[PDB]
Amino acid sequence: TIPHLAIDPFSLDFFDDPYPDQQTLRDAGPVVYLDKWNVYGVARYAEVHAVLNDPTTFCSSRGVGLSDFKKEKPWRPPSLILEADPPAHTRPRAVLSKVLSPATMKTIRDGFAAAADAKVDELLQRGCIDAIADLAEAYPLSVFPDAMGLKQEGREHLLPYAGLVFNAFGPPNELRQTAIERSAPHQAYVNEQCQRPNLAPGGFGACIHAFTDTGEITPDEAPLLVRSLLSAGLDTTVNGIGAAVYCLARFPGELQRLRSDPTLARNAFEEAVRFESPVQTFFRTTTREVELGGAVIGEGEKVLMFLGSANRDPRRWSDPDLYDITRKTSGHVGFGSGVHMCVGQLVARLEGEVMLSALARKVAAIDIDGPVKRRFNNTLRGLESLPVKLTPA
């Protein structure tokens, strides 16, 4: 009944060009079995959306990586929010939601926008830049660690730590095992910055700790919640912004539409998140026997969701393989869906918006002018290097 495929979605070959294999996964059926890792897979929009929106059946507390926490030891203590189910999930979620709220966005927006404009001005002075190191990485590094309240020293640990986190959701292949064996100094740095004294007044970290007397979280929960933001909050945005620049670089017609109306900046970023899906995959674990897309899945089974595939499913999208900055994007699953839907999406969208706004106002053309190199990660899709010439408006 369920088709068995030998495709390895965590192989370098797959990362290098996932789109044909994603169609093969979609068209094989609503539910497939991946013999390579003994997991179920769903690659169509409908089943991905259904799985995300039934957290009781498709739980997160047994891990959202390949590893089943019921069978193996987690590589680090479980996240109090990502790797928790309701009801344990609910209060920590509410705290991060309030920390990363509308009001907070108002407090940081001017600074984020100023930093974006400044960066683009700087890059225009150079002309030929690497849109990954010099923009997609440099810009979030120039705003997010400060917004967290982190000291300057040690910040070089942040991207390596995130690379590790996202590789660790994968199977135990070379990417994952290499990441873990290099991890000790990055874990040590992160865990230390999560303590209250090390987080500057007014930043996200301090704000999490301040919530520890409302009864929503205890003081001993705050460091792990700071840890959540230091795991999730930087490398995601690097690859979201890199995706957007890469799209504008390949679709100059859409860059020209964006220039003509910079208020399209926020939807141009959202469309990039759909189109590239910086977060490609992650898992749920079944808590009972369940019927999904006409297939029966047993209890205690890992289910791999292909978010990127769902976001290109022609069953859901018209011209899914086109970058269209006026597309109606609502419903894409690039930020997830349901109770775990990205709690930092307002920060992500703010960064993406103000960067694309700066590009929209200051740059006339973005031309790739060197070899493009891809970065491999078990969960993240993005580039290592994107050489571009920026022409000033």
Pick the closest to residue 348 from 189, 184, 252, 235 (CA basis): 235
Can you say whether the dihedral through the CA atoms of 63, 69, 70, 71 is positive or negative? positive
Restricted to residues 64-123, the positions that interact with ligand EH1 (CB under 6 A) are 79, 81-82
Among 43, 59, 64, 310, the residue binding ligand HEM under the rule CB under 6 A is 64
Is residue 279 part of the contact set for ligand EH1 (CB under 6 A)? yes
CA distance 123 to 228: 31
CA–CA gap between residue 134 and residue 119 (Å, rounded): 9
Residues forming a β-bridge with 41: 32, 304
Out of 81, 165, 249, 354, which residue is the one contacting ligand HEM (CB under 6 A)?
81
| Degrees to nearest 5, angle at CA 63 with 59 and 64 | 80
- Give the residue with the Cβ less far from ligand HEM, 203 or 334: 334
Q: Are 249 and 366 in contact (CB under 8 A)?
A: yes
Distance CA 158, CA 19 (A): 30
For ligand HEM, the binding residues in 185-244 under the rule CB under 6 A are 228-229, 232-233, 236-237, 240
For 32, the 3-state DSSP assignment is: strand
Confirm or deny that 89 is annotated as ligand binding.
Answer: yes
374 is in an annotated binding site: no
Is 340 known as a binding-site position?
Answer: yes
Stretch that binds ligand HEM, among 28-36, 102-110, 113-121, 338-346 (CB under 6 A): 338-346
In this complex, which beta carbon is closest to Cl ion, that of residue 78 or of residue 300?
78
Rounded (5°) CA angle 38-39-43: 140
Cα 14 to Cα 271: distance, rounded to the nearest angstrom = 23
51's contact among ligand EH1, Cl ion, ligand HEM, none, with CB below 5 to 8 A by partner kind, is none
Contact 136, 245 (CB under 8 A): yes
Of ligand EH1, ligand HEM, Cl ion, none, which one does residue 273 interact with (CB within 5 to 8 Å by kind)?
Answer: ligand HEM
| Contact set with ligand HEM (CB under 6 A) | 60, 64, 81-82, 93, 96, 100, 228-229, 232-233, 236-237, 240, 273, 278-279, 282, 334-336, 340, 342-344, 347-348
| Contact set with ligand EH1 (CB under 6 A) | 79, 81-82, 165, 227-228, 231-232, 236, 279, 282
User: Residue positions in the annotated binding site for heme b?
Assistant: 89, 93, 284, 340, 342
